[PDB]
């Protein structure tokens, strides 16, 4: 574990983490994909194989010793509000088993579902908040990456609003 466990956030490429692993946003079909899934597969090619996995799941795929969580949130596009809500809670779910068995000591991880499988809303808040609700009881240092100043501000404040 970390000695002091902290929530911090970046704006930068995910795939330039400085984090013991990385979660992926990726598709349930190991698909190249777009966004932070493509970056992904550019940076850990080996890690999409045999990635594939429903959505609301993670699936771990190492790229040499370097840990690749996949993790499908839903689309929004496709999901009732209601049945993607719960999809995206339990991905992130997934997300903590993976973290805790793997005994990192950090963890890169992006707002799963805020981007292309949005449904054209913003879900910083509602996809922030379930991240906490599964990372909280974990021990990883957890850094959280985004792209967009706006949302680095409002990831910073959700996060100091807690200590
Ligand atoms: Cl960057
Ligand atoms: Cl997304
Ligand atoms: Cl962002």
Redesign the pocket.
Known sequence: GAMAPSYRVKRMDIAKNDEECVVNAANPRGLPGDGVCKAVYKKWPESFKNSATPVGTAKTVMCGTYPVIHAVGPNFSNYTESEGDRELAAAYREVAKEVTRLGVNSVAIP?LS??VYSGGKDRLTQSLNHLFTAMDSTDADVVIY???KE?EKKISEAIQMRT
Do not use: A, K, M
Request: hydrophobic residues 30%; contains cysteine; charged residues 30%.
């Open positions: 707002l805020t981007g985004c792209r967009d949302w």
